């Protein structure tokens, strides 16, 4: 263990955490709060960005001087990935799209980019890897999202055998596409059952998967405390928000019930207590509003 990567300090901003992290997909919704939580410990956080450097401004107050290194990367360029991961001791993958674009489909985003990141991270000697799949990833699933994400989970497992794959159910926060989707929809009620998980709980889970040495080669399923139906959840979101872009793949995933996987460990096996929706839903939906809580199952 190198001398510069021994932890020092009281775990604050100006400390050294010993985590040298590369966070792919950090310019989005999970990478925002993950780079916040890594930078408040004093971690060297490499943020490979694909977008305009204007869109990485909000990440810059999140750490101390020199602690975030922004560098360019293309997903179809293995040289840029090796140029980004060859100094890390943990790699976090957060590349995702709710929609398939002209240059990238669900296959390239969920299979080719994670497998190339995991393979180049294997041949660069990175000790830990954290892959972020979805809870409802299935080969025979109705949505192309979850099909390619189950295939990418399989490939990340087979090409980086000590990867820590984490399954969130449906993450809610201020910048989500779950509660803000339901609040701006003004699609229907079915027998779909969900248990959403709060983003700070997911982020503390990813930190505790970085730090715990027993999380290598495991698979985690991050779910919230309360299973809800779809209809009473959507009416609760319309009720808290004081209310009377979409695609068919998103609608088929909203109507996908959140599966229960008790054989996989969760937040409570990482020391994270899942915050319920009834503490944070007003924090999410206070922006939308110009209340009896929802029924559980």
């Amino acid at each position: 263990l190198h001398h510069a990567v021994i932890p020092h300090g009281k775990g604050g901003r100006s400390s050294v955490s010993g985590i040298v992290a590369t966070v792919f997909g950090a310019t989005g919704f999970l990478g925002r709060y993950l780079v916040n939580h890594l930078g408040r410990m004093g971690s060297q956080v490499i943020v490979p960005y694909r977008c305009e450097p204007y869109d990485t401004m909000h990440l810059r107050p999140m750490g101390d001087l020199g602690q975030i290194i922004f560098m360019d990367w293309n997903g179809r360029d293995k040289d840029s990935i090796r140029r980004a991961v060859e100094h890390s001791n943990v790699v976090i993958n957060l590349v995702g799209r709710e929609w398939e674009t002209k240059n990238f489909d669900f296959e390239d985003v969920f299979v080719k980019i994670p497998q190339a990141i995991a393979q180049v991270s294997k041949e660069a000697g990175v000790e830990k890897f954290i892959h972020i799949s979805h809870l409802n990833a299935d080969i025979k699933s109705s949505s192309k999202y979850l099909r390619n994400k189950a295939v990418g989970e399989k490939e990340v497992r087979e090409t980086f055998p000590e990867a820590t794959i984490i399954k969130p159910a449906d993450i809610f926060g201020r910048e989500d596409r779950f509660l803000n989707y339901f609040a701006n929809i003004r699609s229907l009620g079915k027998k779909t059952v969900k248990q959403p998980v709060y983003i700070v709980d997911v982020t503390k889970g990813i930190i505790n998967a970085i730090k715990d040495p027993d999380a290598r080669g495991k698979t985690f399923a991050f779910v919230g405390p309360n299973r809800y139906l779809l209809f009473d959840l959507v009416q609760y979101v319309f009720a808290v928000a004081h209310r009377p872009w979409t695609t068919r793949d998103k609608v088929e995933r909203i109507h996908t019930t959140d599966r229960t996987l008790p054989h996989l460990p969760g937040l409570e096996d990482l020391g994270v207590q899942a915050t319920p929706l009834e503490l944070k839903a007003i924090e999410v939906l206070r922006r939308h509003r110009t209340v009896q809580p929802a029924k559980t199952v």
Binding site: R174, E175, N180, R287
Partner: protein, 110 residues
């Protein structure tokens, strides 16, 4: 007919500029912002003085509504009566302003 075509063209150009001014920066996919004044949460305090200047405007505007046909009124064959009633209307506007003065009506918006 030409007047209505002109008004309709002006309204159409104004509506088109407003529609472009509300839709062209909404083409951007900038960011959805979270957590979107001197007085914080008080009600609006009613100022009597602003109501008084609005009512004084309305009454003097009615006196002006009486005053408007004078460029046609000078053309009459009863000029003594016309001149007397014209000076009498402007004098009644002056008496209304003088009474507004002398009863502290024009105070702190003088």
């Amino acid at each position: 007919m030409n007047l209505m075509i002109t008004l309709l063209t002006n309204f159409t150009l104004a509506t088109l500029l407003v529609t472009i001014a509300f839709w062209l920066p909404q083409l951007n996919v900038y960011s959805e912002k979270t957590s979107p004044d001197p007085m914080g949460s008080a009600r609006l305090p009613f100022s009597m003085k602003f109501f008084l200047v609005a009512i004084t405007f309305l009454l003097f505007d009615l006196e002006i509504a009486l005053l408007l046909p004078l460029p046609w009124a000078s053309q009459t064959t009863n000029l003594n009566t016309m001149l007397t009633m014209a000076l009498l209307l402007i004098f009644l506007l002056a008496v209304s302003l003088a009474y507004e003065w002398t009863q502290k009506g024009l105070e702190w918006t003088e």
